[PDB]
Amino acid sequence: DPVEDIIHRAISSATNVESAANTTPSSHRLETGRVPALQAAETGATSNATDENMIETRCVVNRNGVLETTINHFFSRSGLVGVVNLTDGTGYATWDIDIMGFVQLRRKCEMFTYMRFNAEFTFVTTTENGGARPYMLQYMYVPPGAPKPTGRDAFQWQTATNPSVFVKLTDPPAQVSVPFMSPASAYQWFYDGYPTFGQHPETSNTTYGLCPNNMMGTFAVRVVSREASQLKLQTRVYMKLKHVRAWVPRPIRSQPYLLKNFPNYDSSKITNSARDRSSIKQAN
Amino acid sequence: ETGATSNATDENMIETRCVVNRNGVLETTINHFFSRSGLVGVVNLTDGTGYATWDIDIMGFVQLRRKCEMFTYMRFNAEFTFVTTTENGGARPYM
Amino acid sequence: LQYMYVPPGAPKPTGRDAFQWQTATNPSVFVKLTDPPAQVSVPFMSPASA
Amino acid sequence: SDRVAQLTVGNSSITTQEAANIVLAYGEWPEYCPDTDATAVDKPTRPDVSVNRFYTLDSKMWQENSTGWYWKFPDVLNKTGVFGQNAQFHYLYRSGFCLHVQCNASKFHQGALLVAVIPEFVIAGRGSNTKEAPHPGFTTTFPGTTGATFYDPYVLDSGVPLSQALIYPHQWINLRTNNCATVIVPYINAVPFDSAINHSNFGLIVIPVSPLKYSSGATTAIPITITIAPLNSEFGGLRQAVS
Amino acid sequence: NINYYKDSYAASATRQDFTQDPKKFTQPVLDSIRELSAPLN
Amino acid sequence: NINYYKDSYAASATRQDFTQDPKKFTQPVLDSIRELSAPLN
Amino acid sequence: GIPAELRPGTNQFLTTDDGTAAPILPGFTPTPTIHIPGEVHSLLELCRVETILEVNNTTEATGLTRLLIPVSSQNKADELCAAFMVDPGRIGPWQSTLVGQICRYYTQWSGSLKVTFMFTGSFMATGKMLVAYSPPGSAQPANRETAMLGTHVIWDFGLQSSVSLVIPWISNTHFRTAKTGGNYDYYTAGVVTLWYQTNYVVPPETPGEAYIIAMGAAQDNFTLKICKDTDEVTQQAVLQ
Amino acid sequence: GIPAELRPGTNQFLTTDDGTAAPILPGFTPTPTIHIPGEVHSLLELCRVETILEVNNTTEATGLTRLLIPVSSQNKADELCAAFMVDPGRIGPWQSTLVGQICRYYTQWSGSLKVTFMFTGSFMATGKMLVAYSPPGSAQPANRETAMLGTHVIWDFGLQSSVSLVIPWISNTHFRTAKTGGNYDYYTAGVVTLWYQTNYVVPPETPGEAYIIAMGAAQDNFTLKICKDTDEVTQQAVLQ
Amino acid sequence: GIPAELRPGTNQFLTTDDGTAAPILPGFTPTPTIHIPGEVHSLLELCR
Amino acid sequence: ETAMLGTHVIWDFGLQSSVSLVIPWISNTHFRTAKTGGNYDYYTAGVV
Numbered sequence A: 001d002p003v004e005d006i007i008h009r010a011i012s013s014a015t016n017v018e019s020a021a022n023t024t025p026s027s028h029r030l031e032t033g034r035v036p037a038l039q040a041a042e043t044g045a046t047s048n049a050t051d052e053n054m055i056e057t058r059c060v061v062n063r064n065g066v067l068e069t070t071i072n073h074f075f076s077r078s079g080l081v082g083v084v085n086l087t088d089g090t091g092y093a094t095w096d097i098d099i100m101g102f103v104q105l106r107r108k109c110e111m112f113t114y115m116r117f118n119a120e121f122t123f124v125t126t127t128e129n130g131g132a133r134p135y136m137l138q139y140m141y142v143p144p145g146a147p148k149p150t151g152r153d154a155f156q157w158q159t160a161t162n163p164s165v166f167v168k169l170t171d172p173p174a175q176v177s178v179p180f181m182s183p184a185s186a187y188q189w190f191y192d193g194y195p196t197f198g199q200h201p202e203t204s205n206t207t208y209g210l211c212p213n214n215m216m217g218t219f220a221v222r223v224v225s226r227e228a229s230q231l232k233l234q235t236r237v238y239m240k241l242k243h244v245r246a247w248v249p250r251p252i253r254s255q256p257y258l259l260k261n262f263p264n265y266d267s268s269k270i271t272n273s274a275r276d277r278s279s280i281k282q283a284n
Numbered sequence B: 001e002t003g004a005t006s007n008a009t010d011e012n013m014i015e016t017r018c019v020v021n022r023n024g025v026l027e028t029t030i031n032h033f034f035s036r037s038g039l040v041g042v043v044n045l046t047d048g049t050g051y052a053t054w055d056i057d058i059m060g061f062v063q064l065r066r067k068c069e070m071f072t073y074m075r076f077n078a079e080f081t082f083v084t085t086t087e088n089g090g091a092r093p094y095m
Numbered sequence C: 001l002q003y004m005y006v007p008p009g010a011p012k013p014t015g016r017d018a019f020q021w022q023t024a025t026n027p028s029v030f031v032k033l034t035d036p037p038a039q040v041s042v043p044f045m046s047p048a049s050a
Numbered sequence D: 001s002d003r004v005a006q007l008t009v010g011n012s013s014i015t016t017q018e019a020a021n022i023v024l025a026y027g028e029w030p031e032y033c034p035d036t037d038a039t040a041v042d043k044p045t046r047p048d049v050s051v052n053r054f055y056t057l058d059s060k061m062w063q064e065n066s067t068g069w070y071w072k073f074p075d076v077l078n079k080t081g082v083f084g085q086n087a088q089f090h091y092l093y094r095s096g097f098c099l100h101v102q103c104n105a106s107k108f109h110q111g112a113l114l115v116a117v118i119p120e121f122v123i124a125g126r127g128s129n130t131k132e133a134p135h136p137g138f139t140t141t142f143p144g145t146t147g148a149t150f151y152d153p154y155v156l157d158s159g160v161p162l163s164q165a166l167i168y169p170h171q172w173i174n175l176r177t178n179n180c181a182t183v184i185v186p187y188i189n190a191v192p193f194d195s196a197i198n199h200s201n202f203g204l205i206v207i208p209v210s211p212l213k214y215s216s217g218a219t220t221a222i223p224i225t226i227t228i229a230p231l232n233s234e235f236g237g238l239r240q241a242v243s
Numbered sequence E, F: 001n002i003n004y005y006k007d008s009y010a011a012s013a014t015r016q017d018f019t020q021d022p023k024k025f026t027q028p029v030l031d032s033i034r035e036l037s038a039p040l041n
Numbered sequence G, H: 001g002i003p004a005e006l007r008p009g010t011n012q013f014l015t016t017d018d019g020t021a022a023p024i025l026p027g028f029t030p031t032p033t034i035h036i037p038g039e040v041h042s043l044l045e046l047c048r049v050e051t052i053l054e055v056n057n058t059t060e061a062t063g064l065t066r067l068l069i070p071v072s073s074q075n076k077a078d079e080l081c082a083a084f085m086v087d088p089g090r091i092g093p094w095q096s097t098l099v100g101q102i103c104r105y106y107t108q109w110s111g112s113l114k115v116t117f118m119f120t121g122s123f124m125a126t127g128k129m130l131v132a133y134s135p136p137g138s139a140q141p142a143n144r145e146t147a148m149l150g151t152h153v154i155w156d157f158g159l160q161s162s163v164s165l166v167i168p169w170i171s172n173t174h175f176r177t178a179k180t181g182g183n184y185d186y187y188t189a190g191v192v193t194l195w196y197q198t199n200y201v202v203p204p205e206t207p208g209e210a211y212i213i214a215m216g217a218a219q220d221n222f223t224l225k226i227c228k229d230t231d232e233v234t235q236q237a238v239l240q
Numbered sequence I: 001g002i003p004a005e006l007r008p009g010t011n012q013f014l015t016t017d018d019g020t021a022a023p024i025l026p027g028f029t030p031t032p033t034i035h036i037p038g039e040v041h042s043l044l045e046l047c048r
Numbered sequence J: 001e002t003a004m005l006g007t008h009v010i011w012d013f014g015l016q017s018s019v020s021l022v023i024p025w026i027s028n029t030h031f032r033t034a035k036t037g038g039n040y041d042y043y044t045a046g047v048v
Ligand SMILES: CCCCCCCCCCCCC/C=C/[C@H](O)[C@H](N)CO
Pocket: A097, A098, A099, A100, A119, A121, A139, A140, A141, A163, A164, A165, A176, A178, A181, A187, A189, A214, A215, A216, A217, A219, H024
């Protein structure tokens, strides 16, 4: 009775798969019209020709494990993400928490665009000659907006609101757990965009690709003492990705790395993906 | 002038949509706000009168004082921790 | 000290402070000399059945 | 019954007689934002006819020595039509797309294109500096309707090889088999609504892998036209115009 | 399956996932193709 | 939810509070006002 | 005994940690509780109470004059009265509120806000005002035909001497990091420019310079995520 | 207290270990999840997607020419077109695939493989090709009468422009260590020599030089055992 | 935490001792067993 | 780029050698007077 036109699913299906797939026995095909070997790669789909329809196979009850290949068992292996150098005699050292600076764990994380995980940090602090001297350290976590410490014995080390860890050099290394601290719903490693409005330049726009949903703060460290002790330190920070979910896979890096935040490469030296051989007509 | 705040909700000012909100109001309570240990006193001991005292008054350091001056009456338990070092960093086996 | 385990095919370390010691995928154990000795368990890692 | 198709969206329709198939990106359809995932508290606008229709861009001539091309979405439609006016008055934005790349050639021509869709496609600079450093200009990152030619298509101008770029949603335009590629893409972002001016979600890319070859006497001018269309688009946060 | 804190992110790794769904990456097409037929007809 | 001493103050933090009552600070008036009416009449 | 093996994190002192500790006084029974009025249970009871903004924070006022916004009879139409950003946790008028001082202990606020304007002129003075919130994507609106496009409330002076503009929650992300000014203008939220709708009309023998006291609080869906230390404090000694 | 006694492995830090750790922020509730399309659950979703091999990895191509295999009209019969080893985890054409780059993070692969050839010539050009896999025990076959004895698929050019040779899993051991080239040729798997079945026949006024794009993926029974670090990466600084 | 007190025999390494140890590879599933003839179960099969 | 904004049909040459653009009835009035060219351009209908 009123205006009528105001009144007016998916494809994939997940299966719990425990072991690898089996193989059923086959026979020989002598008939026309039914062909499993001819494909069309232009349709954007991969080939679906199974090996029972190409050759004659046997019955194999397959008992291999598909457990270690999941994204939880692949990323729950802690690797180095930052090295903080402290020379005492300004007395302290800070570290902007950015794990895109070391290349063993970066390339594993660049397989995907969006990742949602918890972390588990570990701080292995030594001296420059090996370590083990009984001095006491303090590790603050400074969130974005909190005042960073400006002295060896400044008042920001009172630490009444934000977390901190007291541990000696001669103890086992300190280890905490860190939740999902981003304001978005996933850490994105590739942000094709600009953070602010305005006229963006042509020569050197250092803001392209800056994602402020990933900047998580500052990690500060000092030696808990009054008089300046004279000993050079290094901490090493190891991040273990746990409870991890990943979205939108992308190809893996093939060019050698350059800057932390920007995916630069040089165009004058492009390394080939496959190392060369003599000719195409021989295999070795 | 009535001493009350405004009660105008945003559904009565503009046209809104249906939002099922799932944000956490847990970390803002007064237990999770004050259960974070901060510095309240520094006791200096130079041996050679041989001892040192400290009148227990936490109104001397300003990080934890200003959090406690939001309220007039407070009733709590405490949990002290004593981090003792030397003047050059610490770790000498004395009792 | 640091004890890495390098599987067959993984790059062996070529320096005292090389980049293979970042250890983002394969296992490693950090332990001092003055701790009790480190101890792990290792499964059946052969491609055959014995 | 599979090579013939028609795609009617809005007041526009595309016919084809030599198609291959239609690809849904990641197996999902573009839809509106549900109430359990929305974070704004205003009511969105949904024009649904005036903004969901096939917009035809300009044509790119394909030659012997073409190194390839890339557009940013929704960058190319911020200045065309009523979608270009709703994406300037409104701060927030959400949509899907439906892409269609036409390229015909005769029975005596040969070659192949790779039409893929890359979410969050970040352009790299081309210098051997370790900090200053070179960064791409604004007309290179956000090119507009005229697109931009690749400098190094082997690494997709991002240090990432083309040989693995079939993990993205894609089709092929093989000139002996088909003449058109169709990819339907949902909304892929870490936030439910995001700005349509700062942030372009994905980038369409057409790269000729095997080159165009033809014997003498054939038609030398082979153009590539691209016709795109928003689907299930909705806006929010009304204000004055910012381009 | 144990936790000593009330915070759910301080726990160890959770239960195993055991699932995969390759049909959204391998065959993301509308007209579903069979194996024993020609994909273009 | 564990304690190793008989003294109740040696325990950890207790159960969560989950309640708030803002009507004693926001609207502490006798004549209760509605929203859709004029507050002075 | 039970064969145990130690893990990393042994012998450390995490400040925010939640563990037991040995009591000093066994058998202790404290002083009994009495009823004391006005108990808080969370800090979102305190962020809903309207407190005064310092909109007139220029270098000329220097005192209690800083709290109030002047109005008068204008010769031209279309004119502007005041303007301020909407950012709890930014330098400016919000810094003198309970919302703007509790959102400095916390990172990543979320939710709507509200701004209440009270008019402190005489009874015989009449007028109308336009109060407009404009979401980000541009600079402060230059005239009334631009600021009328955003969210706005037209306010008539009368017996009910107070209006309230409810600033909605329009955002792309669920949370805004509450630290802004540099490259963090990705998290800004907008302006509340005040415009003359008609005029400030006044009879003879009545003062032609009136004031407006502006207030600010948060709505019912306001939250705060990550607790940090505030930057409003300095110290250089022990307070002997 | 409880009488405990410590064991070896005390105070160590195993990187792959699975234990709890003390949280820094109590009472934390993160930002809620939304629906983002295309979630992976394991890496065997990524090893089934066909990506392009670089069969023409000579020292002459230098670019995007490296991906494609040339065909033309031959004067003699029986001739060879291309050849490559079957070893995910060996230097050569497999190194530019998702299979050949995820099988470098893992030791000891297992299962079948598949190679899809797409022909990018003109419509009027016809021909037939022989695609032969030969199990190990010898060198690359020298003529077509030797390579016809192994597993092979005869492919006719036509409207369906793609064939797929499914390389079966023929092995003595359950797993192949994915590092080979020296004394580890105990774990090699074979060659995929391409032979002309008849010819590349072409009408007049049609180009007589066509190309083939070769693709590669893994079957449904493909697994990977021991996780290690990849050798494709170098670093000599901190990336300032 | 739980108030514990240590005993003698702390931090030693007895070779014949029977205790657990932390695994290096989580989620590991080995190569499946086949039937190989002639399995021993004790050394008194060999002394006869 | 201007004519693509109106009603349009993209036509591919092939075995089906004919397309048909259906010009819809878009008008303010119910009828158009069928005499036009001067001041009667109030009743015009468009271009193909
Ligand atoms: C006393 C404890 C101090 C250490 C606590 C560190 C907590 C902050 C960690 C936040 C989560 C990881 C940081 C973000 C990951 C990547 O680096 C960024 N997304 C960079 O793009």
